[PDB]
């Protein structure tokens, strides 16, 4: 013989539905058995816009069972009735007001906790009142109702709110008085032509029956759905990016991030495009080949890596990925180290390297020791009575970090000194016969040395 109650609800797309919200159960014998209520059945799907049905069941001490049913709408776009024109409006006293109470004051109703709720939007009327709207093309009507707070001191105010859809009563309140907290009415208006909002007089005629339809609005189902994109994002996140090439994994990571962003758009085309792109990048993934051999042209770099890994013979991509620290001896060319994606530390002081660009994309290389390089860059051959040489020494950013050029005779005398550019030109017509050295001094964070050329006059 238990009594189980629950009224229709509505949520927006952003909100988390509580299937048990506003469900209560009582039993004269058992007392309050709300916590004993179970969901018997539902068509509810999370993440879906719709008007869902939930059936609730409860069973007391003596095994007697009661049921009830209500709908829960999950909607997107809203249209305030105060932003529309009514087809017709009657009112017992005063004028129907858009976005104000009938008194002209702000719409104000009573909350359950006896605070006052002040509303920006709604319809202010007065019993007896019938207001008719064109309801074509809308899904849900939602409103708060109660006695306007302007008449809080008037004692007698009393009304009943009723909602008719195409002439049929679909929702109503009990009699509401000044001290009655606001009530919500959530009504299915799908495939309808008119809604009629009625404020009846209850007791004491219409006296002081200032009545508000606060935040009265239509709510429509969403014109997008985020569910497939959500699933694709989840599917993508399951994949082990270690199975795939750096490049293709990066593309996928980027598609995942764009998917997460597109969910916030609440826009069908944006969501659909992000899903298409994510599916594309998933299908575009390329399996890594950790056994592919890496070209390491510098025999000293090859020996350095072989020693670090304790192996002989060819170095593979997987081998390169295992490097976290590496010490170099005798290296001139870092070609191959582009593949050392996990490298954290490179100890290469007193090597022979003029170009750090192969290290540029090593994202974890936080410790680079590359001081006191000496690069024997060979002979320059005079032509047109001059020598022209390259003085580019590249850091990881591809910046030329050469600082100064010094030209030195056979007796160690500096004969020319200038700030370094990308190239230098030396007149050889006015030099005494013999050997000359060109010292290109360079310096940058962690990277320094001399690049040396010889020329003969
Ligand atoms: C819009 C408005 O304030 N109308 C009031 C009405 O509520 C009240 O029943 C009546 C009592 O004489 O006085 C009118 O002025
Ligand atoms: Ca009344």
Mutate to test the pocket of ligand 1, among 207, 211, 212 (most ligand atoms within 8 A of CB): 207
The DSSP call for residue 241 is G
Distance CA 144, CA 152 (A): 18
**What separation in Å is there between the alpha carbon of 435 and the centre of ligand 2?**
116
Whether residue 132 sits in one domain with residue 87:
yes
> What resolution (Å)?
1.5
Neighbours of 226 (CB within 10 A): 23
Strand, coil or helix: 391: coil
The CATH number that applies at residue 194 is 2.60.120.1060
| Protein residues with CB under 6 Å of any ligand 1 atom | 93-94, 102-103, 126, 207-208, 210
Residue 203 is labelled as binding a ligand: yes
Mutate to test the pocket of ligand 1, among 104, 126, 155 (most ligand atoms within 8 A of CB): 126
Residue matched to tokens 């009582």: 26
Distance CA 50, CA 10 (A): 10
What are the start-end ranges of the E strands in 335-400? 345-347, 367-379, 386-390
Distance CA 400, CA 393 (A): 5
Whether residue 303 sits in one domain with residue 275:
no
Helices and strands, number each (H, E), in the chain: 5, 30
Q: How many CA atoms lie within 13 A of 117 on its CB side?
A: 21
Whether residue 210 sits in one domain with residue 120:
yes
From the list 314, 368, 307, 357, the residue with the least C-alpha distance to 334 is 357
Distance CA 148, CA 102 (A): 9
Neighbours of 125 (CB within 10 A): 30
Residue 208 is labelled as binding a ligand: yes
**What separation in Å is there between the alpha carbon of 81 and the centre of ligand 2?**
24
Cβ–Cβ under 8 Å, residues 142 and 77: no
From the list 423, 426, 416, 412, the residue with the least C-alpha distance to 451 is 423
Length of the chain: 457
Distance CA 11, CA 13 (A): 7
Domain range enclosing 322:
289-365
Whether residue 108 sits in one domain with residue 56:
no
Protein residue with least CA distance to atom 8, ligand 1: 208
**What separation in Å is there between the alpha carbon of 141 and the centre of ligand 1?**
29
Q: How many CA atoms lie within 13 A of 250 on its CB side?
A: 3
**What separation in Å is there between the alpha carbon of 110 and the centre of ligand 1?**
20
Whether residue 415 sits in one domain with residue 305:
no
| Nearest-5° Cα angle at 317, 314 to 292 | 70
Whether residue 206 sits in one domain with residue 123:
yes
Whether residue 180 sits in one domain with residue 246:
no
What is the total count of domains within the chain? 5
Partner residues linked to 424 by β-bridges: 389
Domain final residue pick, 330, 348, 365: 365
Residue matched to tokens 């007698």: 156
From the list 155, 171, 173, 154, the residue with the least C-alpha distance to 163 is 171
Own/partner long-range contacts of 117-121 (Cβ < 8 Å, ≥24 apart): 117/144, 117/182, 117/214, 119/144, 119/212, 119/214, 119/215, 121/80, 121/82, 121/214, 121/215, 121/216, 121/217
Distance CA 23, CA 238 (A): 38
Please state, in angstroms and as integers, the Cα–Cα distance from residue 317 to each residue in 225, 238, 244, 284, 320, following that order.
Answer: 43, 24, 12, 21, 5
Whether residue 275 sits in one domain with residue 261:
yes
Residue matched to tokens 């006293």: 93
The DSSP call for residue 447 is E
Q: Would you state the structure tokens that stand for residue 323, as one six-digit string?
A: 């490097």
Residue 321 backbone class (left: φ over 0; alpha: ψ -120 to 50; beta: rest) = alpha
Cβ–Cβ under 8 Å, residues 272 and 231: no
For CA atoms 348, 349, 351, 353, give the dihedral sign. Answer: positive
The DSSP call for residue 287 is B
224 Cβ contact partners less than 8 Å away, ≥ 6 residues apart: 76, 266, 267, 268, 271
Q: Would you state the structure tokens that stand for residue 84, as one six-digit string?
A: 């529309």
**What separation in Å is there between the alpha carbon of 149 and the centre of ligand 2?**
15
Q: Would you state the structure tokens that stand for residue 271, as one six-digit string?
A: 């969501």
Strand, coil or helix: 229: helix
Cβ–Cβ under 8 Å, residues 372 and 350: yes
The CATH number that applies at residue 19 is 2.60.40.10
Protein residue with least CA distance to atom 7, ligand 1: 208
For CA atoms 202, 203, 205, 211, give the dihedral sign. Answer: negative
Cβ–Cβ under 8 Å, residues 380 and 454: yes
Whether residue 170 sits in one domain with residue 123:
yes
Residue 158 is labelled as binding a ligand: yes
Whether residue 236 sits in one domain with residue 184:
no
The CATH number that applies at residue 346 is 3.80.10.10
Largest separation between any pair of C-alpha atoms in the chain: 125
Cβ–Cβ under 8 Å, residues 70 and 17: no
307 Cβ contact partners less than 8 Å away, ≥ 6 residues apart: none
Q: Which ligand is nearest to the CA of 200?
A: 2
Cβ–Cβ under 8 Å, residues 296 and 315: yes
Cβ–Cβ under 8 Å, residues 189 and 135: yes
Kind and range of the H or E element at 336?
none
Mutate to test the pocket of ligand 1, among 93, 199, 201 (most ligand atoms within 8 A of CB): 93
Kind and range of the H or E element at 70?
strand 65-75
Residue by residue, DSSP assigns 129-189 as: EEEEEE-TT--EEEEEEEE-GGGTT-S--EEEEEEEETTEEEEE---EETTSPPEEEEEE-
What are the start-end ranges of the E strands in 43-91? 50-59, 65-75, 78-80, 88-89
Whether residue 158 sits in one domain with residue 64:
no
Cβ–Cβ under 8 Å, residues 416 and 377: no
Give the distance, in angstroms, between the CA of residue 368 and the centroid of all CA atoms in the same chain. 35
Whether residue 185 sits in one domain with residue 257:
no
Q: Would you state the structure tokens that stand for residue 307, as one six-digit string?
A: 């020693």
Cβ–Cβ under 8 Å, residues 184 and 224: no
Domain final residue pick, 75, 105, 136: 75
Residue matched to tokens 């050295």: 437
* Atom number, ligand 1, closest to the C-alpha of residue 207: 9
Residue 210 is labelled as binding a ligand: yes
413 Cβ contact partners less than 8 Å away, ≥ 6 residues apart: none
* Atom number, ligand 1, closest to the C-alpha of residue 210: 7
Residue 30 CB burial class (10 angstroms; 0-12, 13-18, ≥19)? middle
Q: Would you state the structure tokens that stand for residue 394, as one six-digit string?
A: 């590249």
Partner residues linked to 124 by β-bridges: 97, 212
Domain final residue pick, 238, 264, 282: 282
């Amino acid at each position: 013989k238990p009594i189980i109650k629950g009224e229709n609800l509505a949520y927006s797309m952003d909100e988390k539905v509580d299937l048990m919200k506003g469900i209560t159960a009582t039993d004269i014998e058992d007392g309050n058995i709300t916590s004993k209520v179970q969901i018997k059945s539902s068509d509810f799907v999370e993440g879906k816009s719709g008007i869902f049905t939930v059936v609730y069941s409860v069973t007391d001490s003596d095994g007697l069972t009661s049921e009830c049913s209500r709908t829960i709408a999950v909607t997107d776009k809203e249209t305030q009735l105060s932003d529309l024109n009514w087809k017709s409006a009657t009112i017992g006293s005063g004028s129907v007001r858009k976005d104000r109470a009938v008194s002209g004051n702000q719409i104000r109703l009573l909350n359950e906790d006896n605070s006052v709720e002040t509303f920006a939007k709604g319809i202010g009327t007065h019993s007896y009142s019938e207001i008719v709207y064109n309801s074509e093309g809308y899904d849900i009507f939602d409103t708060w109702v109660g006695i306007d707070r302007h008449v809080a001191d008037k004692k007698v105010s009393s009304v009943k709110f009723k909602v008719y859809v195409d002439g049929e009563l679909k929702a109503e309140t009990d009699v509401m008085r000044i001290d009655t907290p606001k009530k919500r009415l959530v009504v299915d208006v799908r495939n309808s032509k008119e809604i009629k909002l009625v404020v009846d007089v209850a007791d004491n005629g219409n006296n002081w029956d200032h009545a508000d339809w606060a935040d009265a609005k239509f709510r429509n189902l969403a014109e997008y759905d985020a569910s497939e994109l959500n699933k694709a994002i989840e599917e993508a996140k399951k994949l082990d990016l270690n199975n795939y090439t750096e490049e293709s994994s990066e593309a996928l990571k980027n598609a995942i991030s764009k998917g997460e962003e597109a969910l916030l758009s609440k826009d069908k085309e944006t969501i659909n495009s992000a899903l298409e792109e994510l599916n594309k990048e998933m299908n575009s993934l390329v399996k890594v080949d950790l056994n592919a051999v890496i070209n390491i042209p510098d025999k000293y770099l090859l020996k350095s890596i072989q020693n670090q890994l304790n192996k002989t013979g060819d170095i593979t991509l997987g081998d390169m990925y295992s490097l976290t620290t590496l010490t170099l001896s005798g290296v001139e060319d870092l070609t191959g180290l582009e593949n050392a994606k996990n490298l954290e530390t490179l100890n290469m002081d007193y090597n022979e390297v003029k170009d750090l660009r192969p290290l540029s994309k090593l994202k974890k290389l936080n410790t680079l020791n590359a001081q006191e390089q000496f690069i024997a860059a060979g002979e320059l051959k005079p032509s047109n009575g001059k020598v022209i040489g390259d003085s580019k020494v590249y850091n990881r950013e591809g910046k030329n970090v050469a600082k100064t050029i010094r030209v030195v005779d056979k007796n160690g005398n500096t004969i020319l000194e200038q700030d370094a550019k990308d190239e230098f030109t030396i007149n050889t017509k006015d030099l005494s016969s013999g050997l000359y050295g060109v010292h290109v001094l360079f310096e940058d964070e962690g990277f320094s040395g001399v690049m040396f050329y010889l020329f003969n006059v």
